[PDB]
Structure formats: structure tokens, C-alpha cells
Design an enzyme around this catalytic site. Sequence first.
Site, short mmCIF file in Angstrom:
data_model
loop_
_atom_site.label_atom_id
_atom_site.label_comp_id
_atom_site.label_asym_id
_atom_site.label_seq_id
_atom_site.Cartn_x
_atom_site.Cartn_y
_atom_site.Cartn_z
N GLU A 1 9.88 -39.73 64.77
CA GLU A 1 10.88 -40.70 64.36
C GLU A 1 11.91 -40.92 65.45
O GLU A 1 12.40 -39.97 66.07
CB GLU A 1 11.57 -40.23 63.08
CG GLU A 1 10.61 -39.92 61.94
CD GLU A 1 11.31 -39.29 60.75
OE1 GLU A 1 12.33 -38.59 60.96
OE2 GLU A 1 10.83 -39.48 59.61
N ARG B 1 13.23 -37.80 67.52
CA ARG B 1 12.88 -36.52 66.91
C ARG B 1 11.77 -35.86 67.71
O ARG B 1 10.71 -36.45 67.92
CB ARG B 1 12.46 -36.79 65.47
CG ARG B 1 11.86 -35.63 64.71
CD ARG B 1 11.64 -36.06 63.26
NE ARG B 1 10.91 -35.08 62.47
CZ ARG B 1 10.90 -35.05 61.14
NH1 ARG B 1 11.60 -35.94 60.45
NH2 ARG B 1 10.21 -34.11 60.51
N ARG C 1 18.97 -28.70 56.98
CA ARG C 1 19.50 -30.07 56.95
C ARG C 1 20.80 -30.04 56.15
O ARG C 1 20.81 -30.26 54.94
CB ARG C 1 18.48 -31.04 56.38
CG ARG C 1 17.23 -31.12 57.25
CD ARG C 1 16.22 -32.13 56.75
NE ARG C 1 15.03 -32.13 57.59
CZ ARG C 1 13.94 -32.86 57.37
NH1 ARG C 1 13.89 -33.67 56.32
NH2 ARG C 1 12.91 -32.78 58.19
C1 DAN Z 1 4.59 -40.79 56.90
C2 DAN Z 1 5.44 -39.50 56.75
O1 DAN Z 1 4.95 -38.46 56.45
N1 DAN Z 1 6.89 -39.57 56.98
C3 DAN Z 1 7.73 -38.31 56.83
C4 DAN Z 1 8.00 -37.73 58.01
C5 DAN Z 1 6.76 -37.17 58.73
O2 DAN Z 1 6.01 -36.40 57.81
C6 DAN Z 1 7.18 -36.30 59.86
O3 DAN Z 1 8.12 -36.97 60.67
C7 DAN Z 1 5.98 -35.89 60.75
O4 DAN Z 1 6.35 -34.79 61.56
O5 DAN Z 1 9.00 -36.50 57.81
C8 DAN Z 1 9.76 -36.48 56.64
C9 DAN Z 1 10.79 -35.38 56.55
O6 DAN Z 1 11.67 -35.38 55.64
O7 DAN Z 1 10.75 -34.42 57.47
C10 DAN Z 1 9.90 -37.82 55.72
C11 DAN Z 1 9.11 -38.84 56.05
O8 DAN Z 1 8.71 -39.58 54.89
#
Ligand code: DAN
Lengths: 522, 522
Positions: free
Chosen positions: A377, A393, A457
Amino acid sequence: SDTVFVRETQIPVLIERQDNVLFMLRLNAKESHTLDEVVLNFGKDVNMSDIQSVKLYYSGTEARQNYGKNFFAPVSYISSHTPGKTLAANPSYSINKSQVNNPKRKVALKANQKLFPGINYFWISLQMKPDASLLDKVAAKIAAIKVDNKEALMHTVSPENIVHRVGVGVRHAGDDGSASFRIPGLVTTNKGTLLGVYDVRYNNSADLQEHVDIGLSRSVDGGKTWEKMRLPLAFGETGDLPAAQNGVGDPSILVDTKTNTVWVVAAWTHGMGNQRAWWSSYPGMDMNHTAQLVLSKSTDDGKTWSKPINITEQVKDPSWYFLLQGPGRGITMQDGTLVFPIQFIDSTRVPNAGIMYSKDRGETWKIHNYARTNTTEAQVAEVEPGVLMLNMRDNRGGSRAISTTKDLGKTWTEHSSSRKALQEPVCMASLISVKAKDNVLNKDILLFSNPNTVKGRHHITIKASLDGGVTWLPEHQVMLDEGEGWGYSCLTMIDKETIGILYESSVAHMTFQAVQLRDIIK
Amino acid sequence: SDTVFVRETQIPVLIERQDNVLFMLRLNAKESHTLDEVVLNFGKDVNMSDIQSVKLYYSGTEARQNYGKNFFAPVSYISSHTPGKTLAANPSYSINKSQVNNPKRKVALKANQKLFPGINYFWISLQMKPDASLLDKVAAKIAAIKVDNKEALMHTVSPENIVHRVGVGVRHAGDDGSASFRIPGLVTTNKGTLLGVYDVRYNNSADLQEHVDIGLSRSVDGGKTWEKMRLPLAFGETGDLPAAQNGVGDPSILVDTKTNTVWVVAAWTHGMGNQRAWWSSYPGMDMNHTAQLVLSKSTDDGKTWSKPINITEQVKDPSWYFLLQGPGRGITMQDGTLVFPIQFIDSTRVPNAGIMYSKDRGETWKIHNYARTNTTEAQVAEVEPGVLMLNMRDNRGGSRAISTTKDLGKTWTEHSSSRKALQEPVCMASLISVKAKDNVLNKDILLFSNPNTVKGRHHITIKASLDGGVTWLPEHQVMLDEGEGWGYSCLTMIDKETIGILYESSVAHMTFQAVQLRDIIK
Ligand SMILES: CC(=O)N[C@H]1[C@H]([C@H](O)[C@H](O)CO)OC(C(=O)O)=C[C@@H]1O
Ligand SMILES: CC(=O)N[C@H]1[C@H]([C@H](O)[C@H](O)CO)OC(C(=O)O)=C[C@@H]1O
């Protein structure tokens, strides 16, 4: 002699809540028998007409093995998780001993509580007027505690001059029949309208795949009040599968400042059983093999939204397992280019962040190269004209990665702040750029928000940079929520002097707060 | 060419549910494009008048990494956990493709379901009429499956001649404002009334300490209908503490057969913060230090219940950390002695099971010596006059421990069946004795129920012994629930030919079923 220890909280005071934890009190009653009263003084600048009530609760004792661990409560007092029961203190955990409605600046709260021969927990609850302004700041001090008809010794372990800020629980657990809400994105339209988007996770808080829609809350009054939830993206039983095998999630939202058209991008996952899309999306291009990148647009300031626009084939390399947006928000570049952060798991199943851009007002999009391996992300900001800064991230742990590009993702240059300046527990983070022309300080500033930790968090914090993200001075930071939560957040400027933040907090699944730009840069 | 694999379920069919899972179907559609219909044939002895409808649901596909694991569903179709939503199939997981109300013995369920290119899950739902009889047995077969307008190949992985049994969800998640219900006890009064007791765990399913009452469901018609929940034991804000620091739990109930007075014993935990009583009860005798052993009694056939009788001072050694009843039921011996199983954590922090008895109709109680070290929950039965058999949860794992006493627990003898005959996953188990005159076989029998496993709480099974517990023959057993649950159960005799069982099942927190004695001893 016995001493009453006091810990003041640093969490949002939700305006619509019936209770908010303001102070916690611990008294080990080796000699005390009865707590008679607590006297409270609000600060001289508190707007008392915006306060509905102040309450004193007794919450019992502690397990004997936990004596000496410096806890200030035996349990969490107000659920943010139980559907339909997150506005008021759980009465099985807390006994209302005293309440004062429409209080004066000085409040006497009579307890007359017989004390357990051991640890005793009390707490003070603050309830605002439903009408209260989002800019309200509440300060208060415990002036005296009477025990056995005598003034009791007190010791406060929390710092002085805590500023309590209010907020709005835009979404609570259970609202509109949904177990949970997650993954915020937030923008301000050219008309000043606030648009906040999120996952509506109906069955539980699990990530895709599941029954998930994109919801949207719209405010025309700076975040004070929010229109009924809209669903820009929802696929139901599309393609003959159950709704829980048609979730759409991780929204990102942007305003096209050149036209005020608003774009929401999300990941539509089709099939995949009840397993996590991260591990269930595979190479290919159609809905039966891989997650679809879909858009919805609004040309009427966020009131109505198009049916889904599928752009997968424009931008997805067939060899990738999974292409999706970076959740949160996008931007319009000075030159009119629209940019959404993105991330793709490549043919080796390693995730990488980058950006996707449109030069034709959203008709077509393109991705060049990733910024950095093993990142997910990310959020992007135009730190200088033509210079995009991507803040990522990083699965290596412990700190955000930061790189810049002046050719829209063909080539990336590691930034001096990368993997050093901004610690994280590996979690979404928000980054925006505010230009001197557009804010009350007539300075270029970067705003960043995330959990200010390397583990867990909690301690959600807005940080400001005055040198284009080279330096983030602890002086220019506001800590909004010391409690634990899901950690995601997204920033916007409400107006030239006020930051808006929508985030996953310890008090509501979607919490909105307004923070004056002068509070963070004095 | 494609094969439809079928797995028939072996779980209780709840009479008040709108859906019950009867068959699961899996079709990996390498060639197939459409599933047209499924034809069902109920057995010849099914009472169709008690069947309200049958339904065919489509539940989509599977995550690709889970192909070849022989799964028959992507997710649990009907929750027993979600408060207020445990009676009907979750619509987001299952699309109702066809429904036939008041079906004939042979039923065609259309689908015209377009198939996913891969795994496809279907299932058949059975809904009873609300007034159906507890003794109903439902047998069925899938006579045909039409795919692409041809008869499809079928392969059934589950055994032949499955008998589907109905039952009643006495308590469901969310009922009467309680998140969960746990720990069943069940007796039959001298007037044929059924009395079932349980933890009412209002906030969540955690053990004591928490907000917990003892609840009681009363039935005068063999368990078909149950009166409004009563609360024989509840302490609320006793001793000036919050209700959640006053839970009372793990009930055991017995009928004094000489008078029909009914007794419930439970553990009242006072204080202890929000921690588990197992680790938070300490040596001592009063409520501020140690769990209290409390009784309530009924002299009007279970309709009204006395104020609590605190018997802790009669039976607890001060050096014990925790003394409590063994959950479930107790007994009246032939000579009129009342007996409750008990368990105590001794001064070396090891739990030991034993028995507590009264020779004066419950006015005073006594405990002698433990039967076996490192044992906890137990149930007792008088296998022959003056010989008490204690059947115990054993922390060593894998199997029940069994010992007997002829002097009310002064001295104990390990039984030949101990740590051999009755496997367990370390869980509560029910044991009762039914004397020859009180059943239609005119033979002394022992009845036992537990999760018939060494790992996991599933396959809840009733076992019968015709030789005082020396042997438990595999043929004298009925497996009621292949699903996973919390595992506890309690048996009673409804009448001379019918067994009643109240247990924590995969379909309802408190599930009642009636099983004819001849079904188990053919
Ligand atoms: C498609 C998906 O899974 N998105 C998830 C994302 C992902 O799993 C991670 O970034 C991979 O490492 O993480 C989390 C989280 O609260 O940590 C929420 C998101 O909805
Ligand atoms: C007082 C108490 O804690 N009773 C619990 C009991 C106990 O913890 C265990 O038997 C000790 O080993 O176990 C469980 C269980 O579902 O396994 C539920 C009971 O409520």
C-alpha cells in the site's frame, strides 16, 4: 495513606456517543472505605454549552495477580466492535454513580461508593451536545477527591495540558446492517464537499474475499453531518455467484480538480471461495481468474455514481497475480494528470508499489514500472511540480519507504527519508501535499498520518513536514488516538486552515476529526 | 467427463430453523456448463406432513489453492454464532435457486445454474413444519442430477442409511439479549417435567469471570416446547461490584427423587476484574478471595427458585484455590443421599475431581477425598446400590478416567474401563444410570455422551453400556452431530423409552434432542 492515581485519556470524544472515557482512576484501598466525591474543573476556554453531561462510573476491582501492573481499568468500557452497542458504556462493566447534565465549569460528582478491600477502578465520562462543533477542544483537571470525608492524596501519571478533541463516528459497528467498516479514503471536492469512502464488510471484518461493498459518506458542512450512506460499487450476485464471492474493496478516491468529476477505484474479486484475495487472485485477465480493477465516477459532486467501469485490460500485466489500487486517495497533478497509487503481485508472487495515471480525464490509464520490491500500500503526493513522491508500506518492517519520480513511474529515485524518517508497524499511511497558495501559512507542507509505532496499530498521529519530507519534526505532530485499532487513515484539507482526517480508530470504525493547521504548525 | 460428488450431512435438523443443511454437492465443471435440476426421494417412512419445504442453493466456487482438498462447501452456510441470525441461511453465501413447499415424497429442484469453470458448490436445505414431532426421522436419497440436459455421474462419499434427526434450539445466540449460552445440565422431575440449565453469557462466550447468570428452560411436553427462560441464580451488583464482576456459572442440577425438590449448584465469582476465575480464585473462604459455591432450590417443579444458599463454609478447604461443582447434573442414590460431582484446585495448584453429598435432603453437605489427581469436570452415577461411579475429565489427555467408591468418596478404586474405554478430547461428558424398572428393556443401563474423539469437539455421541460400564459396544451408539462445537452435553430419561439430551451443538448453543432407547439398543 492511600493514593488515588489518575490517568487522563488521549482519544477522540465522539459527539454522538452517550459516553466517552475522559479520566481513569485507580485506588488501592488498604485503609479507605468509601469514595464520596470527585471534583472536576474544565479549562477556562471550554465551551460548556456544547457539553451535555459528565458522569462518574465505578467499574469494580482487579484480579489479584494483576496488582502492581499499573492498569487503570479492568476491561474496555465502551465497545467499538459490538454491532448496535458502541454508543454507550456497557452497564455490566460500569455502574453510573453520578451524573451532571448541562454542567458548569466546576462539576461535583457524588459517588458514595463503598470500596473493595483492594484495587478499585473509577472513570469519568464526557458526553457532548449532539449539536457540538467539530473544532471544540476540551481540557479538564481533577481538583479534589474526597474519601472517608477527607481530602484524598492524588497522583496523575498522564501529562499536563492534554487537549481533548471531538470527532464524528461516521460509521459504527452494525450500522446499516453491516458488521464492520474498514479502509478509509477521503477527499474534498472543488465545492468543498467532503467525500469519505470505505469497505462495508457485512459479515465480519475479514478482508476480501467476502460480502463487501464500497460505501460513501458525503458531507456539505465540513464533516459535522453526513448524508445517508451511498454504495458507489456493489456487485451483489454478478456473474451468477453469491454476493460474498463478489466483494469489492480497498477503495481509493480522487477529485479531478480540472472538472470536479470524482473517481473511486476499487478491487472487485469474483469467486475465490471464502479465502483471502491476496492469496486467491491468480494470473490472467478475466473475472474468473484475477481481481478486476473497477472505477465509478460522479459528475454531480458525489451524489450519484456510475455503474462500474472495468479498466483491468488497460493496465494489468497478465503475468501478475493481483493488481489493485493503493487504498486511500489519489491526486490531480498540477498539469492535470490524474494519479492513483497502485500495487501488483508479480509473476514471482512478490508485491510491488507504483502508480497509475490518466492524461485524458480518466478515460485511459497506464502503469510503467514499480517503485520498490516487496512493498504494497502506498500514497502519492506532488511534492514539487512534476515530482511525484510515493510513500510505501514496506514488508521489510519498521519504516515507510519513500521514492520520487518525474517521469510518471518509468524511473524511481530513492529519497533521503526512505526507511528512516517515518516509522510504521507495516500498515496503510496517508500522505498529502498542501501548496502555499492553498493554506493559511503560505508555505508548502506535507501531511502524513499513521500509527506512530513499530509494533501494533495505536497512537494514530498526523505529522507535518516543512522541507518537502526531508524532516518531520516531533514539534509538528498531533497524536489523536492512543488506543488500539485497525490503523488505516486518510487525510484531506477541509479548507485553507483545517485538516480533515477519516480513520480507523479505537472508538469508531470510521472516525472523522478536524484539526486546525495552526495546531500542528504553531 | 464430470462427476457430482455428494456428502450427506449428519447434524440435527432444527425444527424452528428456516434452513438445515441436508446434502452438499461439488461439481468440478471441466466439461459441464449448466446444472438443470436435482431430484430428491425421501424414504418411504418419512412423514411428509412434517416437512415444510426443500430448497436447492448455489454457493459458488472455491479458492484455487483449495482444489483437491475434498471440501464440499466454501464456508459455513448457517451460523450458530451470530446473534439474532442463526435460523436462516446467510443469503450472501447461498443463492436460493429453487424451493418446493409441502413437497411430495419425490421432489424435483430446478436450478438452471450456469456453472463456474471450476469447482461449483450446491446444497439441499430441509425445513420442517414448526409443529413437527421430536421423534421424526428423515431419510432421503438424491435420485438424479441433470447437467446439460443429461443425467450426470454421481458419487456419494457419505455412508448409506443415514438417519437425520430433528431437535429444538432451546437457546440461540442472541436470545433474550445474551450473546451466548454454554454448559448444559438436564433433569426430569418426578412429574415428567424437563429442566435444562445453562450459563447465560451476556457479553461473549468467555468463561468466568464475566457477566453470567444461570438460566433455566422448562418443558412440560417432552421438550417440544419450552417456557420463558428463568434465572435461578443471578447476582447482579451484589457486594457493590459491577454485574460482570459477579458472574455465576457452570451449573449442575439434580432432582431429589424422594420429595421432587430440585437443586441447582453453581460457582459465583465475585471481583477478579475481567480475568478467568480458573487463574483468579485464590485460597481463602470469603467472596473477596475465592469462588463461592451457591445453591438454589425449587419446591414447585422448577417454576420458582429460592434465594442463593452459600454453602462454601460447609465444604471448602481454605487452602484450595477454587472449589466448584462438576457441570451437568447430580443424582439421588437409592438410599436417599443427594450427590453432586465437584472439583477443587488444591494448595499445590492441581485440580482434583470428587463428590459432595447430603444425607439430610440438602440442608448440609460434605466432601471427603478426591478420586484422582489432575482431573476436573466429572459426572457420577450409582451403578449398583451403594456403588458410585465417577467419570472424569482427565488433563492427561485422550480418555476419560473412571473410579468407584462405596464410602461416599473416602476411598476410591480405579475402574477397569479407566483411561481406556471412553476416548475424549478433554471436555465435559455426561453419565447417567437408568435402572431396569425405569426403562422398557427391564435392564440396568448406563448412558454416556461426549465428543467421541481424542482431538476437537465434534461427533457428539451417546453410548450405552449393558454391563455397568465395563464395555461400551460400538453398535450401541448414536452419533448426533458431526459438526464442531463447544462439546458439552447432559443426558436424562424423558420417559421409560426415550432419552433426552441437551448439548452444545454445531447448530444451536443449547440443542435438545429425543432419542428412543430402542434406537441405541436394538
Ligand atoms: C486485498 C487485501 O488483502 N488488502 C488488505 C491488505 C493486504 O492484505 C496487505 O496489505 C498485504 O500485505 O492489509 C490489510 C491490513 O489491515 O493489514 C487490509 C487490507 O484490506
Ligand atoms: C470455572 C471454569 O473455568 N470452567 C470452564 C472449564 C475450565 O476452564 C476447565 O475445565 C479447567 O481445565 O472449561 C471449559 C471448556 O469449555 O473447556 C468451560 C467451563 O466454563
